Design a protein around this motif. Structure first.
Motif, short mmCIF file in Angstrom:
data_model
loop_
_atom_site.label_atom_id
_atom_site.label_comp_id
_atom_site.label_asym_id
_atom_site.label_seq_id
_atom_site.Cartn_x
_atom_site.Cartn_y
_atom_site.Cartn_z
N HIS A 42 -2.78 6.97 8.20
CA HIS A 42 -2.07 6.97 9.50
C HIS A 42 -2.33 8.27 10.25
O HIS A 42 -1.97 9.36 9.75
N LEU A 64 -13.05 8.11 4.13
CA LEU A 64 -12.79 9.59 4.09
C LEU A 64 -14.02 10.29 3.52
O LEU A 64 -14.82 9.76 2.69
N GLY A 69 0.82 -1.20 0.00
CA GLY A 69 0.00 0.00 0.00
C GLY A 69 0.84 1.23 0.00
O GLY A 69 0.59 2.19 -0.74
N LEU A 70 1.85 1.26 0.87
CA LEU A 70 2.79 2.38 0.94
C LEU A 70 3.44 2.65 -0.43
O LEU A 70 3.54 3.83 -0.86
N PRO A 88 -8.66 15.51 1.82
CA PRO A 88 -9.39 14.33 2.25
C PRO A 88 -10.45 14.58 3.33
O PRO A 88 -11.34 13.72 3.54
N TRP A 95 1.70 6.65 -7.00
CA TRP A 95 0.57 7.52 -7.33
C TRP A 95 0.96 8.97 -7.00
O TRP A 95 0.66 9.86 -7.83
N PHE A 136 -9.62 0.64 -14.02
CA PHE A 136 -8.48 0.94 -13.17
C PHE A 136 -7.15 0.57 -13.88
O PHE A 136 -6.18 1.35 -13.82
C1 HEM Z 1 -9.57 12.10 -4.18
C2 HEM Z 1 -8.36 11.54 -4.34
C3 HEM Z 1 -7.63 10.99 -3.20
C4 HEM Z 1 -7.47 11.41 -1.87
C5 HEM Z 1 -8.09 12.70 -1.30
C6 HEM Z 1 -6.64 10.45 -1.22
C7 HEM Z 1 -6.26 10.56 0.08
C8 HEM Z 1 -5.38 9.67 0.80
C9 HEM Z 1 -4.98 9.92 2.18
C10 HEM Z 1 -5.36 11.09 3.10
C11 HEM Z 1 -4.20 8.84 2.48
C12 HEM Z 1 -3.51 8.53 3.79
C13 HEM Z 1 -2.06 8.89 3.91
C14 HEM Z 1 -1.57 8.42 5.27
O1 HEM Z 1 -2.12 8.93 6.29
O2 HEM Z 1 -0.76 7.43 5.28
C15 HEM Z 1 -4.16 7.96 1.32
C16 HEM Z 1 -3.61 6.71 1.23
C17 HEM Z 1 -3.53 5.81 0.16
N1 HEM Z 1 -3.99 6.22 -1.09
FE1 HEM Z 1 -5.24 7.76 -1.55
N2 HEM Z 1 -6.37 9.42 -2.08
C18 HEM Z 1 -6.78 9.77 -3.33
C19 HEM Z 1 -6.55 9.04 -4.43
C20 HEM Z 1 -5.77 7.91 -4.60
C21 HEM Z 1 -5.40 7.28 -5.81
C22 HEM Z 1 -5.80 7.77 -7.18
C23 HEM Z 1 -4.59 6.19 -5.52
C24 HEM Z 1 -3.96 5.19 -6.40
C25 HEM Z 1 -4.41 4.71 -7.51
C26 HEM Z 1 -4.46 6.14 -4.06
C27 HEM Z 1 -3.86 5.17 -3.30
C28 HEM Z 1 -3.65 5.20 -1.95
C29 HEM Z 1 -3.04 4.08 -1.15
C30 HEM Z 1 -2.64 2.73 -1.65
C31 HEM Z 1 -3.00 4.48 0.16
C32 HEM Z 1 -2.51 3.76 1.39
C33 HEM Z 1 -1.10 3.98 1.80
C34 HEM Z 1 -0.53 3.06 2.88
O3 HEM Z 1 -1.09 1.98 2.96
O4 HEM Z 1 0.44 3.50 3.52
N3 HEM Z 1 -5.26 7.17 -3.53
N4 HEM Z 1 -5.04 8.45 0.30
#
Ligand code: HEM
Ligand code: HEM
Lengths: 735, 734
Positions: B270, B371, B83-84, B226, B90, B401
């Motif tokens: 997180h 969110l 995920g990270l 978010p 991205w 996707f």
């Molecule tokens: C409206 C668009 C989006 C918003 C507002 C958003 C917001 C976020 C936020 C706030 C986090 C948490 C960061 C943290 O606290 O670790 C996150 C994590 C994540 N986002 Fe998004 N996201 C968006 C779009 C996307 C897209 C387009 C992808 C990929 C195709 C993506 C993949 C991920 C993944 C995989 C995580 C998890 C990270 C982990 O497991 O450490 N997101 N997202």
């Protein structure tokens, strides 16, 4: 603050908030990215020395002298002669020099770029440069702007009756503003521009000897001092103390200072005909219609009898187009009274004096004698008074001092005499040129060099670490701004450098005794061949680098350029050389910074003076650590189990995530590297070490050299950078 | 105070600078980036050759294994960094703006300021550090730019989601790209958006009024907030921000929902401790941090105490494996507004199952969370219809996707000729600006000599028209996303053929003449065929050569054959609208805006063409000597020998007998009057006169105006001409 922000916020061409806006304290590499050969319109392969030597130099001088009296209607010449204006242009080009850091001077032609093109003290020198442009158009690449501005003043003096010692060309042009110079930290120009450099003191007599180092002017935007007196207070005694300080910071003594001021103020006049509110933006702030000019004056045609430059309206002599002794005669023989110019500024006028000073445009009009506060300075200090009194009665002694001081002014940042070009280079050698003896004897050849490298490496007391460290210590005294220092001369063996604590004087002593044995053995036995101590210091470090590469599994040619000579103590002035002494050295892990100059900032600054790129700075530091080349032989930054082998171990171990880095002292200068798993302390590092693992752009280079497989590339790149640095002062050969 | 260090250094550039005194003056900094001296690999390094020799499958094997090798200094959630690593990729690719073509992952800029330290990139410093061992192992044969994206691609595939494939070919860069306009605000998110909304705080009404060409709702964000617009937890208003921001990134509704629902199948956010526990971002951190930042002082700062965004959401019950759980949860749960441990607004299914796993304790479970930006997708009529369809037909989400993720990662890689490696997808996509295979055999030097003679004696063609038309075609190139240029002859297609800046009626008559030359050649030369694209370039190139001969200089102007002609089907009118210039200084076209002067637009365009200041300067002066203005006018044409390649533009510009004065109210027109005769001699624009005003540009003008430099002028012009004509020639390459 509005300061440093445009009221319209561009969205093009770099517009927007920038990284340095968010994180203004982070180290910047900008000063290592200037003066690149892409930016130069002439290309990297253009040889300015060859071009200037092909110049029809006599015809250039005759064209200059003819221009002096060809008045242009858009800036009519005072008294029908631009000579004074051209002398001012040359003096201001050369006049920015600071002896301590070696920055400023005329040698890069920077008057034609920001910020110098727009400093208040350079007001209307945009007209002066424009007037000489047709000479540059005629002669093209064969004379630089840098050379032309100073030649023009030299020719002006000669065509106004003052024979100079001669002239040397050789200043190649630069092509962007030099943003590496610390001109000060003030956010205002003269009349303000000096709270920081006086540390908020306003007591003008008491503070005069307390100007912030390394500065050489009493306000931001001035060449030396304020012509109305300190902070605009018309006190000649305090003005003299400012003059001593500022001219001292430019490397001039009292005799030189009186000779330059009384010599220059034979000629021309100042301009203060109308108030400042009639004057438009400086060149960098002016509209496109001004086509590089500035300070547009809206009264009349803004020129001729309406000229406004400094705000003062002073004509020193009755013959402003001809050398004379009228400056000292007026200064000493008149009684002076404080008056205002037409623009409102303080100046001095003669009491009951003759009304015979000529008007620059009206044959029918005369004026009384006038002086600036900064001219009255010279009779309101005991030492200047004694010099002025002597020269009133002995003008020939002023003419001798002025010729010498003018030549020093124009050539102080030109470098060794092997840089000076043209048919009238003065024959006398002067101490401020850091003289060297002429090279004699049949030069050592490749086979003699191979024999000397083997002899050096097999000598008791010489090892790879000491040889490398000594060579670099000698080389990094070079600075490109005034082309002073480097390895030619073997000055590390002389005072002051032999006693610099940063050279480890006891170890250096033993290294130099061993090199002198090599020298006695070779000289005693190879017929017509002698080797210099300077070539042995460089050859020993070069031999050490070659050996360290071989010991690391890489067979590389490390090329050596012979022919350095050894300076004498009498050619090595202690004051001048004390200005080269480092307070910190990141190549050899010496010393540390202070609040306003961090350890790693000093390192970047020094690299800029060595002309190093970021990759060249990085590779050099990492190889010096691998060589064990610290000034004291310590283990600080020596992140290898194979000290003296030329590997990229420094980078590999610096980036290893099993090491955690923590501060050991209070002051942020010492760091410990601990193994995370064992908890054992493995390494000690300095800020010069850890910056390479912290700054994102330097770290990206560190990673290159840490990558598996890059041992050979590391070696090749170190050797190239080593060769560049050892050869910086080799103007006898080519740069 | 903003943008000032409390301690004022006196070394290494410390002190007040020219830009401080005169901050409105034109700056050439963006023409001095990316210099070969600065690149530690050398200017001769060939990244494509290195990468094609890479053992690609072994690199992916070692990325896959890294995913589940947890490091004690940043332990992996659920035992898997997948995920990270998807987030890292991205965010790398996610800064792209379609209108100006800046941002994206193609220069690897996440490893430099400012992106390394934007709040939305918090803890990606750790992600980059975790992959560094793979870069260290494979060396120069994989760039950081390629690795950060490849890592996310492999992470999807090793968590159950097969992608279309991948293309490498992004060479590393070696300094921060300070040419990008990210905005004019002086704060980051949670602020950072007064200017981009002109001070409006009406979150619904302002959403479609975001300042052009920006593609994020606050400085320091990737797309949107978010927690809702300005942190207001209103899903319907968030949806309007998401459509605006993603559209500005070149994604439509289906692509947008696929990307967000696709990405949030994986991992978690997180928000375990409050932000007061978090230290400085990387660029502000002390040397002990060794390029990391956001040090968290609670416990070891990591594992259960991780703090990134302040939110604590786990979207699915299997955060290491592809599923339809995101949509299943989103649509079926009843949502309540709650606070995370760090104090941020999120949503929870307070009466749902307690079966969402904990990342470190196999005995601990949580309720479903989302969110506010996730609930957006069920609080807009078009997003809801997509979301509902894909709930029931998850194969349609997987298809959308894979295509959108491929587009995200490769949108700035340029032509397909640049794509490297063994799994480049075979489908040709419209956003790749596709080109065909050539037709027949390649023209040789004999065919080129006959075609040059024909072109210079064809009805409707002359030196000025030919040079103007070739440059018009060329200056569409922009190095940020490798789009545009002369390959494809897209000047001949919509929308370029009807751009006002291309003078459509003149262009049509020039293109008809070149097509007649083409028809004569093709079919009367066995299987030799020439493209219209090669004839546009060759005609301009032959015109420059003859204009040099007529100025007294004999020079062989090089020509590289082999361009192809794009079809209109491969040339999308919206995709190409983004390349239309506001002003074009090379052809004396257009005017500036309230935020950028004409001369600033020209320096920006020169940076996109990779030009140095001397290259920019020589090209403008030569285009004037050739009479190559877009409209055939005499503005800036300061010569009596129009069509002859002389430095007359520079000689006459700097002649002091000419006085220049404003003629228009708008600042855009200027007149040069002969001071002795009092007669109007010339008309000029701001693109003309800047070369006589800016001190560094005027220094270059003087070189070309100096006696003796007529041949140097021609040589430098020809070098710059060849460089610009060939920028898109990745087929050779470029
Ligand atoms: C409206 C668009 C989006 C918003 C507002 C958003 C917001 C976020 C936020 C706030 C986090 C948490 C960061 C943290 O606290 O670790 C996150 C994590 C994540 N986002 Fe998004 N996201 C968006 C779009 C996307 C897209 C387009 C992808 C990929 C195709 C993506 C993949 C991920 C993944 C995989 C995580 C998890 C990270 C982990 O497991 O450490 N997101 N997202
Ligand atoms: C304490 C040092 C000095 C101060 C404060 C000073 C001040 C000034 C000022 C205020 C002007 C008038 C600018 C104007 O309104 O046009 C000026 C003019 C001039 N200065 Fe100095 N000066 C100093 C040293 C020098 C030196 C060392 C030289 C050359 C060796 C020099 C040569 C000239 C000449 C020739 C002019 C006349 C320019 C013209 O005719 O247009 N001065 N000086």
């Amino acid at each position: 603050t509005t300061f440093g922000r445009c009221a319209v916020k561009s969205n093009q061409a770099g517009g927007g908030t920038r990284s340095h806006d968010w994180w203004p304290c982070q180290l910047r590499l900008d000063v290592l990215r200037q003066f690149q050969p892409s930016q130069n319109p002439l290309g990297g392969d253009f040889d300015y020395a060859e071009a200037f030597q092909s110049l029809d130099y006599e015809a250039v001088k005759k064209d200059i002298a003819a221009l002096m009296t060809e008045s242009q209607d858009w800036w009519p010449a005072d008294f029908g002669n631009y000579g004074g204006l051209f002398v001012r242009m040359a003096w201001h080009s050369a006049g920015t020099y600071r002896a301590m850091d070696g920055r400023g001077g005329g040698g890069m032609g920077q008057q034609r770029f920001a910020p110098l093109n727009s400093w208040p003290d350079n007001q209307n020198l945009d007209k002066a440069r424009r007037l000489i442009w047709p000479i540059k158009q005629k002669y093209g690449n064969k004379i630089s702007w840098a050379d032309l501005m100073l030649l023009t003043g030299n020719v002006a003096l000669e065509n106004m009756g003052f024979k100079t010692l001669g002239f040397g060309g050789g200043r190649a042009d630069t092509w962007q503003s030099d943003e590496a110079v610390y001109w000060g930290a003030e956010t205002t120009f003269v009349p303000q521009g000096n709270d920081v450099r006086y540390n908020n003191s306003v007591d003008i007599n008491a503070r005069a000897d307390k100007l912030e180092k390394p500065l050489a002017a009493t306000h931001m935007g001035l060449i030396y001092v304020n012509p109305e007196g300190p902070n605009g207070t018309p006190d000649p005694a305090a003005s003299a103390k400012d003059i001593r300080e500022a001219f001292g910071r430019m490397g001039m003594n009292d005799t030189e200072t009186v000779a330059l001021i009384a010599g220059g103020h034979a000629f021309g006049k100042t301009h203060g005909a109308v108030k400042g509110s009639n004057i438009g933006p400086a060149p960098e702030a002016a509209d496109l219609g001004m086509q590089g000019l500035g300070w547009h004056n809206s009264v009349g045609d803004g020129n001729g009898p309406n000229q406004m430059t400094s705000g003062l309206e002073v004509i020193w002599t009755k013959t402003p187009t001809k050398w004379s002794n009228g400056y000292l005669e007026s200064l000493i023989n008149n009684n002076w009274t404080l008056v205002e110019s037409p623009a409102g500024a303080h100046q001095w006028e003669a009491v009951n004096g003759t009304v015979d000073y000529p008007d620059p445009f009206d044959k029918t009009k005369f004026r009384k004698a006038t002086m600036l506060t900064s001219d009255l300075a010279l009779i309101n200090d005991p030492e200047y008074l004694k010099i002025s009194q002597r020269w009133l009665e002995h003008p020939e002694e002023l003419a001798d001092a002025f010729a010498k001081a003018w030549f020093k002014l124009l050539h102080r940042d030109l470098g060794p005499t092997t840089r000076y070009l043209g048919p009238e280079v003065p024959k006398e050698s002067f101490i401020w040129q850091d003289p060297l003896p002429a090279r004699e004897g049949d030069l050592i050849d490749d086979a003699d060099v191979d024999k000397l490298k083997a002899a050096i490496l097999s000598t008791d007391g010489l090892d790879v670490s000491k040889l490398a460290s000594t060579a670099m210590a000698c080389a990094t005294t070079y600075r490109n701004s005034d082309k002073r220092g480097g390895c030619n001369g073997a000055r590390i063996a002389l005072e002051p450098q032999r006693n610099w604590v940063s050279n480890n004087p006891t170890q250096l002593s033993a290294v130099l005794d061993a090199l002198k044995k090599v020298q006695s053995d070779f000289n005693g036995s190879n017929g017509n061949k002698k080797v210099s101590l300077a070539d042995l210091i460089v050859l020993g470090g070069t031999a050490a680098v070659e050996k360290a590469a071989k010991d690391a599994g890489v067979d590389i040619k490390v090329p050596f350029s012979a022919g350095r000579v050894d300076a004498t103590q009498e050619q090595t002035d202690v004051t001048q050389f004390s200005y080269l002494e480092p307070q910190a050295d990141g190549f050899r892990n010496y010393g540390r910074g202070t609040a306003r100059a961090r350890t790693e900032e000093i390192m970047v600054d020094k690299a800029s003076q060595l002309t190093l790129t970021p990759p060249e700075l990085t590779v050099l530091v990492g190889g010096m650590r691998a060589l064990g080349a610290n000034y004291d032989g310590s283990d600080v930054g020596v992140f290898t189990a194979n000290k003296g082998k030329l590997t990229p171990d420094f980078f590999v171990n610096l980036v290893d995530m099993n090491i955690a880095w923590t501060a050991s002292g209070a002051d942020g200068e010492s760091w410990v590297g601990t193994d995370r798993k064992s908890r054992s302390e493995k390494y000690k590092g300095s800020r010069a070490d850890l910056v390479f693992g912290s700054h994102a752009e330097l770290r990206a280079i560190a990673e290159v050299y840490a990558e598996n497989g890059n041992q050979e590339k590391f070696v090749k790149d170190f050797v190239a950078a080593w060769t560049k640095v050892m050869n910086l002062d080799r103007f006898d050969l080519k740069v």
